[PDB]
Amino acid sequence: TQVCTGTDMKLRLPASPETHLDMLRHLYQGCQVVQGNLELTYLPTNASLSFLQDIQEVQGYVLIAHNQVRQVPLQRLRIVRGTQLFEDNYALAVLDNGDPLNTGASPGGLRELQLRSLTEILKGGVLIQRNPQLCYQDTILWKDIFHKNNQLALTLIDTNRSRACHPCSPMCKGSRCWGESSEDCQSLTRTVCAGGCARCKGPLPTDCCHEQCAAGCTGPKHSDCLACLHFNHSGICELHCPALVTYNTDTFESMPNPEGRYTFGASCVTACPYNYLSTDVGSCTLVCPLHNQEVTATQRCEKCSKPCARVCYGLGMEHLREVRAVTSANIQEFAGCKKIFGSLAFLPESFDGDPTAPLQPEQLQVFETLEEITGYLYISAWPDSLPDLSVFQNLQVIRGRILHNGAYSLTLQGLGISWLGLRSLRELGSGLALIHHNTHLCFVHTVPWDQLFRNPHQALLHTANRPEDECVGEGLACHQLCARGHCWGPGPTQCVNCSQFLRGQECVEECRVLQGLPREYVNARHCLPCHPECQPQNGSVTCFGPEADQCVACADPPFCV
Amino acid sequence: TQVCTGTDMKLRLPASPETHLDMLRHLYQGCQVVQGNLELTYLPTNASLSFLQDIQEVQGYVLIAHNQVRQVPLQRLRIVRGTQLFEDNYALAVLDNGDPLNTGASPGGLRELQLRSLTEILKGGVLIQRNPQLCYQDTILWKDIFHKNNQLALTLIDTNRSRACHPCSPMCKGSRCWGESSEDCQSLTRTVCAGGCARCKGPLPTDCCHEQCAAGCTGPKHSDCLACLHFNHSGICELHCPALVTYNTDTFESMPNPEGRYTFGASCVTACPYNYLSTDVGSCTLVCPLHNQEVTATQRCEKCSKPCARVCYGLGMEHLREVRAVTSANIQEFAGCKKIFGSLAFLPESFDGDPTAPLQPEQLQVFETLEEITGYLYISAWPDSLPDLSVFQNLQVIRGRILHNGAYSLTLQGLGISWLGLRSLRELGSGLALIHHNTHLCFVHTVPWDQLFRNPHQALLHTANRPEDECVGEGLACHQLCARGHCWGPGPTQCVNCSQFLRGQECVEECRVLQGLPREYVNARHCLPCHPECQPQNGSVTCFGPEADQCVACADPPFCV
Amino acid sequence: GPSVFLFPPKPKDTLMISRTPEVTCVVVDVSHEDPEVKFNWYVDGVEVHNAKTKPREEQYNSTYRVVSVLTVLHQDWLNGKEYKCKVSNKALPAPIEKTISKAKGQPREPQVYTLPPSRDEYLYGDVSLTCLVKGFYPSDIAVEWESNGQPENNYKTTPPVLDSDGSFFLYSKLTVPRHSARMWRWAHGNVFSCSVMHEALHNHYTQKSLSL
Amino acid sequence: GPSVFLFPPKPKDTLMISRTPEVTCVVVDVSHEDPEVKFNWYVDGVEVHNAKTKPREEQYNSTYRVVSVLTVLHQDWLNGKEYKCKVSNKALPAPIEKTISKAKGQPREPQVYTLPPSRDEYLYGDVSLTCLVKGFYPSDIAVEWESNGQPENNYKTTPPVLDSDGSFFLYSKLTVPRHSARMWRWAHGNVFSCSVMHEALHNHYTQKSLSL
Description:
Chains A, B: It is found in: Cell membrane; Cell projection, Ruffle membrane. The complex is a heterotetramer, with two copies of chain A (561 residues) and two copies of chain C (212 residues). Chain A is built from four helices and 23 strands. Chain A has 561 residues and is mainly β. The radius of gyration of chain A is 30 Å and the shape is globular. Chain C is mostly beta strands. Chain C folds into two domains: 23-101, Immunoglobulins (Immunoglobulin-like); 111-210, Immunoglobulins (Immunoglobulin-like), CATH 2.60.40. Chain C binds chain D through residues 111, 113-118, 120-121, 123, 126, 128, 130, 132, 134, 154, 156-159, 161, 163-165, 169-171, 173, 175, 208, and chain D through 111, 113-118, 120-121, 123, 126, 128, 130, 132, 134, 154, 156-159, 161, 163-165, 169-171, 173, 175, 208.
């Protein structure tokens, strides 16, 4: 809500960097901190980055590379925790932020970092290599930002530099300039501290700071802290959140503890937010762990009345963690799976010999069964012989916890289909939408994506597809009876809230009652098939209830025969 | 219907031989033939045996012994097949039919057999030892009744005899007298036959008889037969009944054969009678065989959509065939068994050390679960500390295929309970009822046993129990609201068709609607508990439907809260 | 000046043999000084003089009420016959002649049924119970209730009305108060029904059960 | 001799501001040789002479029909007020004075609801649809139908009746023929309801939906 989530790009190459540019204004605008890795790549001088004005914390590896900007408005950031690390080693890295190719007055890269607000680090190092055109590196003695731990967590810095530097500001103690301005001086919290004291605003024990606290403090008291180690408990720096329950004196007799709080994203809170999980263990997370499955009550994760229930898993799971994508194999592994516990995606590597075996169109339609997934999606190619993707005639929701490149609920690009028909959607969990490079595609802007969203951060970036202004060619349009034009494709089947009544999947005027041979009755704006035994009638409606009872046209006492 | 069934007495000792006397007038009166073993034991001169006038066939071993009558009205019998054999060896036996203890003029046993109608035998021999006071044994050359098979099926005859005999009638060929009267001469169908001919009314090939036919014939044609080998197909002697279906020329393509007939009790018929089974194999029987279970459509026996379904078995089954009765063991083996596939019984051997372990009262009440059994019952003892048998508060039917001593659907005697409460019975399969030796017992004749019957042959023999004329002492009577007095015991619970309404199991006037705190509503002459959420009311009925909807007193839109 | 009309028989009594309907000729508003009166019953203009007249009854009008009952075997009314009550006085110089009788048209077999009250009409208090009839002819009809064979009295009903179908239609209300005997059975869902009587009815009677 | 009475306003027009009810004074049976007549409208005995009289209309009686409309603002009728139609002729020497007006008592808020037809009353042909009201006072009331906002005309209804509750009660029939527009919606279970208008009604109106 008031925060954003990490990502998984690793020197990744997105498409249409104008979308990459809009890829994050919906993510980080109104965001305080990140739950994972922060990844910045491929950005020219042109940059509307004000939304990054207010950032304070990180949980995973930060990353910049192949970025050709002259400034970054990153300030007020004072924490990096490094739960995830570049190459499983570094907390933050920088590489090849310049231009080796071609009037305009500019260097072609970045000159200075300017990150005075940074004061605390946890597990992880830093790398900065092959980063020409920038100065004020090797300037501030990173060690004084590290903890008493990770003193041996090495780093590495670039020396091959093009342009000359400037001496640090005279208003700064030594040579600690993130930037030439005094506004980029430095304070530290390692050496000057009171002996074993971890952090301090000054060598005074009165200036010393609490152990669990970090980044210094206006005073060693909790409220006066600056960087709470593991959470900001209503404005407090405590080590662990209060337990949910408590056991009695010396008895196996538990009882709830109202002051208890679930563990999540450095925030002791009452309940778990949407898209997340609840556990008797006491942690909101994105996975229901070992010997522990999911139910509702809105989601929760606890054991059932049986060993681990046997269900279908998707990619990224306990046995599909290092998978690339789908292939000839593990396709019928989704046979009639009502609900998958993973993710999936399609690439050309599937539609190619892979000497193994490739895939085929007809070995499909299993997705007429699926009713829910846990992860994300991603597509790259698709055969021309398949006009649409009706195979998904009915899927309820994505509910994508894990995301592609740590950001997308789904992805699709590089195809040649004409339209789409994912009609049974009313909701979407975390993750961001994305689409482009779909030549024949139409009926795109016939969708109220905002409705499907459940997180305000979400949006949709779309381009490189035939627009409505030209799709109307030959007379394309949302179906007639589909309310307010909320179609996914042609035919009434693709409706959502069609005021007229439907047959299984066909909204039309006539729930033909008595004027169609297989008679019908009505319920919930939907047509239903009359009973078999109830003989055909022709005066008025032939049936009155689904079952054999509540009938009229008889062909045991209440039944027909 | 027009026949009776075999039994399993083997020199058995019934109780109150006045019941043993009535034990069979309901079995064999109006019976043509038997489906199993015929067993005659313990009968004095006093005998109303006219119901045995018309008997024609047998399927198992015939038996007489310890019988002190001077005559037997057994005639018109001409077949014995011997599917079951005394000592698994003999087709018919006779032993110790006399009196070794003490005016009246009588010998004290039987003098002559008189069985001229007998002409055919199958697998099995005969024994007659220690049978004093009878003549005309070793008289008729049994071999000429045997088949070309079983020529080596030995026999054995008594010679120790008390009273002198008389020469056979002069109107009989040699010395073939079942009795001194010419009406007991003999004809045979072995030696005089036309060479290999099996049976004949004379040495003429025109007098020869059909192979499959037996007992002779008025002519070798089927209709002219006398003893059909394996069935009397609408008046025909064929070997095997017509198949139910037929496969096409050379294809795995089946199709029904209307002329097909199920195999059972030597009678090719359309369907299987009540209490019996139907099989795609093509045989009505009393057991659903290997890898083959039961459903309805009224019963049928075929495989299901899974290997042999795991359910509970009773005594006499594939692993309880040679069991005596219940013990400390195999008692919790009935845990929550909705439907047993066997039989059971209780003896004192259960309630005794059996050094193993004995049983206990409190380790019971599993029979509040059972809803159907396949076999019979039998009881001999029971502790005084248990007044009743309410533990069977709900059992639907016995449906007893197998029977104790091959005759009883259930048995009970030798106890000291006051009453009984088997209330949820409306039907009973094969088997005969029996009861006696129940001192404290009352509320016995409050039962319409005839209603529970499903076979006209059934009845009930009862005695040696306190009668109604004295049970009324202290004011015993069927419950008030129980219709027409059809009680099993006191309290409304033991009702059957109580016009007044019931709570789970209590028939009373007041389905207290609004005058009892836990409110209620009505359906099917039965009280139902109102919804929880529907708040208490006091104007009129508080609820209108079982579920949260169809309520009035609210404490989501249609629900209360 | 004064004027007087008569009263017809009761359908509940007609169409039922043992019952005895009553063609009745009431008279009111006697003169304070000229009250004398006498009756004469005619059949199409044929005097019989076989009626049973009753005494008088004073009223708040300072006058008296007079009436006489007329006997019926139902036949002539079943097949159709006119009656006439001839009265007189001195306050009026003219006699009376009224052509009251049964009517005829296309008789309609009563289309009948039962229906419950509405979930929303439950409220708290005197609940309603009903029973309807339509497609019947003529309007001369009256019905009653029955309950497991026993009667009910707290009921009421409405007259008939014409529509485009050329027949009549109406319902009958049954008051059912709280904590009372009217609802105890209903809540317990026993045999409720509508005892109907009408000319066009097969055997002059039908019935329809009712419960939950 | 001859005699004449008037006609009251229509409840459908009363209790509705934009509508204009009409107190109407019909006259019939003119004399073949003395037909003249003129009106005068009084209020408790107060002449206004502000009515709109209409021409004549002959009848099978060989006479003419006469009438005049009277204007209304509803107030005086809403709070209570008497009217009087003064007519005359030569065949009768006396004028006319009628105290027709609204009545008053204990007003009762209409107890209202909807109900379906009976499974057994389905038959084949013109099915019935109904809507009932009780616990209302006084009897001056008329209602109509509505369907998804659209009206219906083939309906009919019944007058009210008294019972032990001191209020009134009745229902309204709605013909619904085969293969017609009356039933197409019903089978398809759309918004049917009963548009009711009455004095005691909160805001002088309520409504109750209906469907399957």
